[PDB]
């Protein structure tokens with residue numbers, strides 16, 4: 312939310328992750344935490360970040376299992392304090408609905424990943440992306456993830472989900488995406504390495520914000 | 524959190540509540556919602572505020588029932604999207620523990636109210652307040668509520684809970700409490716009428732912030 316910039320905190324060491332996140336906190340109030348950090352330091356890192364930085368946490372768990380397993384993963388994730396969870400849409404509607412049901416029970420949110428940003432996404436995901444986005448609309452999904460690396464696809468996704476849906480977008484910086492162009496369609500950009508591997512993370516974040 | 528100022532949104536009409544909260548959002552990112560608004564507009568107002576303003580929501584429900592009923596109230600409140608719930612400590616440890624158990628299950632927080640700010644608090648609550656605070660410490664409570672109207676009591680409460688516990692304090696402005704003096708002991712101040720009944724809520728909030 313703050314500055315339309317979400318930090319992707321993929322460092323795998325608690326000390327380095329806490330250092331960088333603290334250094335850029337004045338520029339970002341929303342942190343995306345994924346498996347590189349959680350599998351290395353434990354799920355308790357989510358509540359620690361939430362408390363220490365007063366930031367919202369999106370768990371990038373790319374949930375992609377059968378309904379029953381998806382339900383268990385979402386429950387454990389929200390118990391850990393996550394505000395939202397990112398879920399793949401490719402496994403189908405029943406799998407997404409399972410996540411939505413738990414989010415409803417726990418007062419949390421689901422973000423539906425429709426198209427990925429890397430080269431390999433063109434093989435199978437891109438061809439199903441429009442239909443995955445329409446499925447999200449039909450299921451009542453209001454939060455989506457789309458690719459910074461393909462603004463024409465981000466535009467098409469925005470067209471399907473409408474202006475009221477919230478859209479966040481990774482692939483900015485390291486993967487080649489541009490902050491400003493991405494924000495023509497997405498509500499917020501996700502940035503990882505361009506900030507956390509920088510010699511001065513705060514200066515990198517400030518620079519991105521200034522560019523937009 | 525933002526500016527150490529929490530808005531107590533006790534207007535009873537959705538339109539007025541949304542107007543004032545939006546007007547002061549640049550100064551406050553945390554809103555306390557209680558029964559005056561919830562009983563008038565419904566529990567869905569919590570998720571609406573959270574989404575529309577991107578603010579944290581503390582549900583001031585003064586939970587004060589037997590354990591079994593407290594569990595049900597906390598579950599419904601967190602399902603509605605609240606980030607935290609304020610609970611009375613006077614009904615005893617089992618009643619507080621029930622709230623803590625649900626907060627743990629749902630990845631949320633409990634704030635323990637130890638002493639109230641109004642005149643009547645001197646009759647029964649004040650005499651039990653130190654023991655209620657010690658009970659909170661023994662139960663692992665890390666968030667507390669104490670009175671702006673009695674800074675000497677707020678100091679005593681801070682002494683019992685320690686410097687690492689988070690303490691918020693209502694009674695600022697309308698009830699007579701002072702922002703700066705209260706912040707000598709509390710981490711954040713709660714302000715309702717001084718802001719929401721002001722001719723210019725944003726100017727009132729800005730003034731409080733400037734005074735501290």
Ligand SMILES: O=c1cnn([C@@H]2O[C@H](COP(=O)(O)O)[C@@H](O)[C@H]2O)c(=O)[nH]1
Pocket residue numbers: 319321345371424426427428429456457458481482483484485486501502503504505
């Ligand atoms: O299609 C997607 C979905 N998610 N992410 C994630 O967003 C972050 C982007 O990081 P980066 O800025 O370092 O490339 C990483 O956590 C990555 O797993 C992508 O990069 N692409």
Ligand SMILES: O=c1cnn([C@@H]2O[C@H](COP(=O)(O)O)[C@@H](O)[C@H]2O)c(=O)[nH]1
Pocket residue numbers: 531533557583636638639640641668669670693694695696697698713714715716717
């Ligand atoms: O001891 C307490 C506990 N809670 N509150 C609550 O905090 C808010 C303070 O509002 P005010 O600034 O308008 O007096 C109101 O919602 C009120 O119920 C108090 O005032 N005193």
Ligand SMILES: [Cl-]
Pocket residue numbers: none
């Ligand atoms: Cl990814």
Ligand SMILES: [Cl-]
Pocket residue numbers: none
């Ligand atoms: Cl009260």
